[PDB]
Amino acid sequence: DFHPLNEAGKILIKHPSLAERKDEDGIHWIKSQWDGKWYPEKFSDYLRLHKIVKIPNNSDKPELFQTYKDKNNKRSRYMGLPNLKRANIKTQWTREMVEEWKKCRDDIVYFAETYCAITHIDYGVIKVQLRDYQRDMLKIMSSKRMTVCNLSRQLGKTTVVAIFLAHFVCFNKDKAVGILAHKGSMSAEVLDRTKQAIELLPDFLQPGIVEWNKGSIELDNGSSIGAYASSPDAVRGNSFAMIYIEDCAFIPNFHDSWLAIQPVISSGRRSKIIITTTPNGLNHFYDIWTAAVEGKSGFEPYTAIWNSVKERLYNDEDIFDDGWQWSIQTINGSSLAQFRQEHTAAFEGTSGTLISGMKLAVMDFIEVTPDDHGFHQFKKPEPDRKYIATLDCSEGRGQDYHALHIIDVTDDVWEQVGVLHSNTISHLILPDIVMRYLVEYNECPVYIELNSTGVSVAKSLYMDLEYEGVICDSYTDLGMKQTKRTKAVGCSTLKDLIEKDKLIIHHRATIQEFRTFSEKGVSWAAEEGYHDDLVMSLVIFGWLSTQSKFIDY
Ligand code: NA
């Protein structure tokens, strides 16, 4: 029957068959369902697209600063170690060098792809081959002050975490870094890798080394990296410019250590903080991730799981299968319970759904016969009652649906009184159709999602049909402008509204879409083969609900 992962009726992985194809540059490509990128059919073709680059051995030519290391001059070497340079050596800055240094300074991906190395036994010093997830993480950790990663296990995260920590200390002066982990030996392992990165850097990017031991390093610029077992002592006692928290979810009695962290980041001496971990049930981390993902804590959420290692997407026969058999083989020889625990970064005591099943079980519906159009009337319009309409237009039409909700806003408890749901109505005749329902419900104001179709619909209502009740956040944008944050907090507010019983949903298909509107880290969406149009239209309302003008349309 099912692919192990697809245990219930729900599809968590699509077969290679259903994947989009493409023939280009003499090779057969297959689109991956995890990132929507094109991957060659043959594994051998993937390798000649991600081939190894040797960083050549340079003690000879100081002119070639990109690779130059003064390894043979022992006086220049820190403690006679070839890879490390003595503290306080004056570098001879040429104009080229300054530009390249500065380039690395504010382009972390370039620095990571050009200068970070691993020393291979067969090919010598080679460039680290970054992965798309790692690249994404570098950008985020760099551009944002506070970042939190919900990763799976056996992703080589440390490789990227090391590169970043290296980049920080090598291109910032007088900056103290503290790595915090459950055990101090864990955080010692992290900086070991950071040191493995630092020691392979060319002279011009390598600051001189003052201290260089297991639990601590210090550079001649003033920057340091300290390995610590997580404690409230470590945070208060030190003045950190950056705090990296390793395996955060698996740190017992973290609440006090976390409270010690607050003043260090939150208004605030204002320092960077990077958290990376696999999840561990509904503990303190679930609260961190949720606050980040709902856009409440200023943290930038990021997530990556097994499929980010693209080697797994090619089977034993070296043909692209989008991780179909690797996943089967990894499920076997172990357990589904363990695969979720090891490879999926899912939280234990919960499903993905935005709305808790605890709430989705209590939710009753009102069965009604819809119009010629897609309109479901739950409660008739009443004179002197305030209504609010939200519209998520298709694009689209199956693909997906047009979704209009009408919400009775009069009382303290808001009620969904009408829903238009259609994949048959053209967006050219929709404005009129929608209007008669808006006009039926006491000249109901409407907040339209400004997608390609929405913008158009907004025009027709406000201008062509001269409807004076269309809500706009600006004069260029006649509806809800789509942003990452609007969706995030719209979902967050929708969750609250629904669960605290401020918003009452009557439409069965709406409640049913909530049933499969779940985690699509770092956001929420509909899972395979489901629609989210009805939910997404209510997200619009959620976001509108937070707006001051709404506090009484
Ligand atoms: Na308005």
From Swiss-Prot:
> Which residues does the record give as ATP binding sites?
129, 134, 193
Please list where the region (Nuclease activity) is annotated. 351-550
Query: What is one Pfam family matched by this protein?
Result: Terminase_6N
Recorded superkingdom: Viruses
Positions that bind Mg(2+) 1: 392, 533
Modulates nuclease activity, annotated site positions: 400
Effect of altering residue 392 to N?
A: Complete loss of nuclease activity. Almost no circular DNA packaging
List where the motif Walker B motif lies.
Answer: 242-247
Q: Might you give the EC number(s) for this enzyme?
A: 3.6.4.-, 3.1.21.-
Region ATPase activity, annotated ranges? 122-292
Q: What is the effect of changing residue 156 to A?
A: Complete loss of in vitro DNA packaging activity but not the endonuclease activity
- Return the annotated region ranges for Binding to the portal protein: 319-343
Protein name from the UniProt record: Terminase, large subunit
User: Which region ranges are annotated with the description ssDNA-binding?
Assistant: 21-85
Query: Per the Swiss-Prot or TrEMBL record, what residue ranges does the short sequence motif Walker A motif cover?
Result: 152-158
The UniProt family comment states: Belongs to the Tequatrovirus large terminase family.
GO terms, biological process: chromosome organization; viral DNA genome packaging; viral genome packaging; viral procapsid maturation
Provide the effect of residue 533 to A.
Answer: Complete loss of nuclease activity. Unable to package circular plasmid DNA but packages linear DNA
Keyword match Nuclease: yes
Matching InterPro entries: P-loop_NTPase, Terminase_6C, Terminase_large_su_gp17-like
* Motif ATPase coupling boundaries: 276-278
- Which source organism does the UniProt entry give? Enterobacteria phage T4 (Bacteriophage T4)
What are the UniProt keywords, alphabetically?
Answer: ATP-binding, Endonuclease, Hydrolase, Magnesium, Metal-binding, Nuclease, Nucleotide-binding, Viral genome packaging, Viral release from host cell
